[PDB]
Design a binder for these strands. Sequence first.
RNA 1: AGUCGC
Lengths: 50, 152, 138, 244, 222, 138, 196
Amino acid sequence: FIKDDYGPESRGFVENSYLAGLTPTEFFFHAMGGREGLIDTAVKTAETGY
Amino acid sequence: HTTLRKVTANTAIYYDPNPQSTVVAEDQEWVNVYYEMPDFDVARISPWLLRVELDRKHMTDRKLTMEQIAEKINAGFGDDLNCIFNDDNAEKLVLRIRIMNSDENKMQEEEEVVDKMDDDVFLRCIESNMLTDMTLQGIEQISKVYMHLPQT
Amino acid sequence: GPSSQNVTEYVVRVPKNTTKKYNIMAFNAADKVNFATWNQARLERDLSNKPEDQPWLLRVNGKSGRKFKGIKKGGVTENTSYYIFTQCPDGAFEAFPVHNWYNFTPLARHRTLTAEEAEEEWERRNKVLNHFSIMQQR
Amino acid sequence: RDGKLAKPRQLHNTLWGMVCPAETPEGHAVGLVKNLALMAYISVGSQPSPILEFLEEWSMENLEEISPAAIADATKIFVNGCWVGIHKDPEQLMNTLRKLRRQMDIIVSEVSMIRDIREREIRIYTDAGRICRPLLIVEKQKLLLKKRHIDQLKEREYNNYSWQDLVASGVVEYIDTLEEETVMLAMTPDDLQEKEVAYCSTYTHCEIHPSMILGVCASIIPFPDHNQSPRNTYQSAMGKQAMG
Amino acid sequence: AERGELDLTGAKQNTGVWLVKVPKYLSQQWAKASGRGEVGKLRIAKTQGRTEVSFTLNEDLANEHPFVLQSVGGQTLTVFTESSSDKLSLEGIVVQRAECRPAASENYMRLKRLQIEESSKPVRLSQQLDKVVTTNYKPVANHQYNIEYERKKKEDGKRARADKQHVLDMLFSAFEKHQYYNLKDLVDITKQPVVYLKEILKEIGVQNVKGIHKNTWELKPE
Amino acid sequence: YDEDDDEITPDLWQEACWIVISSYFDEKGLVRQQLDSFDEFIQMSVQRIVEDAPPIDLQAEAQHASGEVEEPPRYLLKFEQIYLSKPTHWERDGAPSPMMPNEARLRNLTYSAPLYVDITKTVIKEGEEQLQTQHQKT
Amino acid sequence: QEKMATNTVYVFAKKDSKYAYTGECRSCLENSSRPTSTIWVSMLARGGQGAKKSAIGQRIVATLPYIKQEVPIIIVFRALGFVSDRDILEHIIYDFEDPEMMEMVKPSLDEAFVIQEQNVALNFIGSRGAKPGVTKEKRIKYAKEVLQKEMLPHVGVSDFCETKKAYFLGYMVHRLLLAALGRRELDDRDHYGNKR
RNA sequence: AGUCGC
């Protein structure tokens, strides 16, 4: 992307559906959002346990 | 909790020991405004001049008066802090501050136990305290947020 | 004339071996040194507090004259060389090798605040509470 | 280990084509153990000495020879984070220096060279251990690689022509993560072509293929982009788990 | 006058000198010109609001270098000289700094990469070793061990315990230099066996130790 | 083959970038990173380390109380080029032979190779001798 | 193994509310002997003892390796021998044209007055760093060798490059002041460009 | 220990 691009695509928002497939960038930003979900599961599991 | 630090645009310290010929010729009519203010011990008060400029926008929101701020600071610090202020009839707002001393006792007896730091340097500690500690309408310590909400 | 059009051309010589070592003496421009006002100078290696590695001591005019410290540059060059191009009475150029590069810097004629006394102790007490008087008590 | 939530667990933005996006364990070590990207490569390290010689000869002034009170305009140049010197014309230097890299007077895989214009700094890196990846070069708003290079690559079936020759044409470059911050990088030849007023025209590199951002196990999984992202991460663990 | 005095005559003339930066290879070529009496010639061409300086190499020595002028305003450069007669003189002030530019930076590089190679070649690690069997020949003993045996086998070995009086004299002679000595030194200076030197030191003297069993003996000074 | 003149068709599609990628793996291959580092480690770093700067010298004590006539002997040790033989194995018989990685796994050996170095001994005692120097490969 | 990049200064806002900002430089001869050297330049904030000057939030100190006590950066400059305050100011910020930078350093200069020569400053670092030793001069020589060998070793390991170290230490203070003005981004903890 | 399972 170009520097300073708050427009919805360069910063987050994916246009496509899981059926259409995610463009490369859309794909990677999605993995960032999926990681939050993986990490939170592990961290939350320990703390509630205690 | 609004501190004077929030309201203040800027501060400046000048050496102006002669109000009647102030370092800012444009400031000169306000000195004309104050000559009846303890004219006897202007030979006794300190020659260092503190000058402050205030934001009109902060001043509007807090809907304050310059006399409220002057009365707040004088009350907060005490009689030592000699304040005078500019005319309200301007979009800008500036406050001019000098320090009075203990008058009679300063005759240099032993050596004047202060260790002779410069009075200006004492003035920066005044300005420091003045920015951080002064609490105009800042009735408490609730950081500085306050968000009003309409509930339906 | 040179202001309009000029051309000069001089042969360049290198002597097989100089009769003396050529060194550089550099000053800070901020010190604005003018040798016009120098009349005497002494230049000797500081060595007593412990020779060719040791720093320089530059003493100008009399004892009351300015003193400077000369510090040796690690090497003249690390991958090149520095040469001096000089004008000779025949009308030629003569080129001389640099043997050393020394940095020379100013020192105060008499300052000396000293910490050996209890200045360090005063620091423990230091609330920025004095400045002139300590300089007077010295 | 075992009790500490943190941001070095979450996939970071810079891991684009450097480290596989979705190939890190699903246990407590999640995100701390990462897996290298497919195209990723790792610099083996080299002596800075040659670069220092070329710079001093080009026009870099030495530290103790300059006058400190006259350096504000000048750009500071560093080599392996060591502040070697200053320069008053960094744009001709960067252009010339890169040209040398394309010509291999300094080792591609090695030297990283970065300019931070808004700060007037030039950092150069030749230490071991930096992660870098190959990209195509584009020039004057178009790709520098032409199909004739492809015909030599077909020819390799009976000729000595190779990927190293391809690097020797200077049509591909190696880019570490620090340098990848300052490039304007087109996603695919298609986009770099259609462009007129579509987005920008200042590109400097292009992606040899975007699906290369995946690491070894993630590449087995077909249509990974039609899947929900953590779904891809469970497959990268299980694929590694299968037998055969 | 003395060697600690710095001659200001040069400075007093206000003599100016030129400062030129040059690449090592050019000066190395000059370095092997030795004393030919020249290395080249300098040419200066001046026009309106512009000056061009250049250098040409000697054609004999070769078996155009443009000059770039440099600022000197930010440093007060001067030169001094350390004579072989141990005399010091301030020779002049730098009025100009400059840089000698190559005729071509680009092709040069081919030579340069080769040039770098010639100074810079530690052809290291480089060639395995295919295989070797020199975990060393086995003599009857170390060669030097035999040297040690030969030395031991030359006269010195047994000692001259006979003649107590001469040995007594030697102790007296020890007492002529210092009041106490280490027994290790006493056997060294006497060349006698320890048990015997002790037997004598018990007879005519005493001992005195210090710190950690550090002992010295004395012939009872009085 | 190119000239950049009669060429008018730079376009090139999917079919072709995979040709470029294939050439990357054909040249490098998937594990390269590990191998390039180890190779550089031998080709450079183990040499660099013995070629350090710690040549050791040793001077035994002499003239132990008496003495006079010179010679507190002095020895210096220097290290040179390093050699590495392909990975060998010695049977209990004592006879070395080449190892092969499959053998190394079955019999539980360690797949390593023997390292040799050139060492020098150097005596420039206090006067009597200086040249007596000997090279070893150990 | 993934580690933090050697030989390069980066600025952090750690937990400790008394350190406003800090400049870290890990400086090993990742090609010498592999030690470490972790110079810290830390900006102190929140306080001022008493009526010191109303706002201690500019008292820049320096950690150094094998030093039992924090010292202000200015002592190190004195120890490098540049007694001239204008010269130290030249190493810190080669653009004295901006009044705001000049004011930012000034209280750190104000601290410097207690020590005004290289030897005594060396005697300060020696005693603040080592085991007690009334030898004074050895404390100076040992400390001299530390500044020579231990501090920013990547910039050199000898007398003949002692000047070069002075610019680099000064560059960190400059790199720190930029963040302290805030015209400079605070450097990320996990950017891959800053990994090895 | 580390890897790993849920």
